């Protein structure tokens, strides 16, 4: 019943850094019985470093493992791509046995853009009254990207859902989806709307907007 | 050989007991090794629920007081999980697996939403740009699939056909129904030339649309 505290929680990390994850426990346990796990999105986590310096098989040597008493760190010398995931160090001298909240790891790479893409209601909806304008921000890092909903040149914040997917595996980018959601009616009752990215890359915010001209 | 897979009802109401099984393939579950059942909570916090050691006697996680119960079938090499008065805190992916050492096995985890929400289809919907798109060296399709529960729902582009270049983004809840969607992206010449569909599957519902996405222009 030990508590494990893992810091930092998430941290990005250049190609080829060394990057040191810590674990401290509430109180002493068993450095034999502190393993580490490393978990990679749609996967459960596999064991990474068992007995606390122990690689476990397929683990690689640029990881290692070092600790006694309350704190164990996980070591990488040189990052790379595929070692973006996220490291939960485990332990099982105490019971009941704990997990430490994890370490979520990102990948630098070349700054980019996100390519924009704005998309009016389909007619299926309309025809139920709702009313979605989606915006796709595709491709782009860093992840910090701000993205603004204008309609005639007002902004509205309420009714939107935005979602980003996790660092892609290939190039390290991420995509973004803002849902502005309105009924048949406001929508109606507008022109031109407005999907505004405010990215760390371009000054000129990346602007794409379409009007309701009912085609 | 050693294999696990979860599996169970991914959907159980608030105040009742969740039962899940792990089956065990390729070695006995007697002839050694404790059997764990492991969870992940939604922002990923791992608990650790209890085990049902290779000799049959069970250790718990003390905080699942009295709602955790461990048993296994020697026969048939599964055990079980069942949990009781649950409620929404229990939503969680629930794995069940052993280890020692370099070695350990996992099974591919189950998802399971404990709500009181009745069960929605969803509603997919062609995203298509608008008339007149200029058309760059490339088109940007996409896929809303709305307000549907509870979660797993499988989104591919042309069975599966279309595979890169596609983004595939996590749902959201709001006002307990998911939303999500997924952009597509493709060469000017090949759209709208080549058929372009969307193939949506909510299990839970029975629900299997297929959405093509027709364009608004020319
Ligand atoms: C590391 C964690 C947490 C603590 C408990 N165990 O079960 C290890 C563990 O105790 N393993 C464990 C313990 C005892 C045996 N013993 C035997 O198999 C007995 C063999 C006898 C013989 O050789 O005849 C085998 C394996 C798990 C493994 C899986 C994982 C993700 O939850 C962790």
């Known amino acids: 019943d030990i508590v494990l505290t893992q810091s930092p929680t998430i941290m990005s990390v250049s190609p080829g850094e060394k990057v040191t994850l810590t674990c401290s426990a509430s109180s002493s346990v068993s450095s034999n019985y502190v393993y580490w796990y490393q978990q990679k999105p749609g996967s459960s986590p596999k064991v990474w470093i068992y007995?606390?310096?122990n690689l476990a098989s397929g683990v690689p040597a640029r990881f290692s493992g070092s600790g006694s008493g309350t704190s164990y760190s996980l070591t990488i010398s040189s990052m790379e791509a595929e070692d973006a995931a996220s490291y939960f160090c485990?332990?099982?001298?105490?019971?009941?046995?704990?997990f430490g909240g994890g370490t979520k790891l990102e990948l630098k790479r070349a700054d980019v853009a996100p390519t924009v893409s704005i998309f009016p209601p389909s007619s299926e909806q309309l025809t139920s009254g709702g009313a979605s304008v989606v915006c796709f921000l595709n491709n782009f890092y860093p992840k910090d990207i701000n993205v603004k909903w204008k309609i005639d040149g007002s902004e509205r914040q309420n009714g939107v859902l935005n979602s980003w997917t996790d660092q892609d595996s290939k190039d390290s980018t991420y995509s973004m989806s803002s849902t502005l959601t309105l009924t048949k009616d406001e929508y109606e009752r507008h022109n031109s709307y407005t999907c505004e990215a405010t990215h760390k890359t371009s000054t000129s915010p990346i602007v794409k907007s379409f009007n309701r001209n009912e085609c | 050989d050693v294999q696990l897979q979860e599996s169970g009802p991914g959907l159980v109401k608030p105040s009742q007991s969740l039962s899940l099984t792990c089956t065990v393939t390729?070695?006995?579950?007697?002839?050694?090794?404790?059997w764990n059942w492991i969870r992940q909570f939604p922002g990923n916090k791992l608990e650790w629920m209890g085990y049902?050691?290779?000799?049959?006697?069970?250790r718990y996680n003390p905080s699942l007081k009295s709602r955790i119960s461990i048993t296994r079938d020697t026969s048939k090499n599964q055990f079980f999980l069942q949990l009781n008065s649950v409620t929404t805190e229990d939503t969680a992916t629930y794995y069940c697996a052993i280890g020692y050492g370099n070695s350990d096995y996992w099974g591919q985890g189950t998802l399971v939403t404990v709500s009181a929400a009745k069960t929605t289809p969803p509603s997919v919907y062609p995203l298509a740009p608008g008339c007149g798109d200029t058309t760059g060296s490339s088109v940007t399709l996409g896929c809303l699939v709305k307000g549907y529960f509870p979660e797993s729902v499988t989104v591919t582009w042309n069975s599966g056909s279309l595979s890169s270049s596609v983004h595939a983004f996590p749902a959201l809840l709001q006002s307990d129904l998911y939303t999500m969607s997924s952009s597509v992206t493709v060469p000017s010449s090949t759209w709208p030339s080549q058929t372009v569909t969307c193939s949506v599957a909510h299990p839970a519902s029975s629900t299997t649309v297929d959405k093509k996405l027709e364009p608004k222009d020319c």
């Open positions: 390729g070695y006995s579950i007697t002839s050694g090794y404790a």
């Open positions: 007995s606390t310096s």
């Open positions: 485990l332990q099982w001298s105490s019971f009941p046995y704990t």
């Open positions: 049902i050691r290779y000799s049959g006697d069970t």
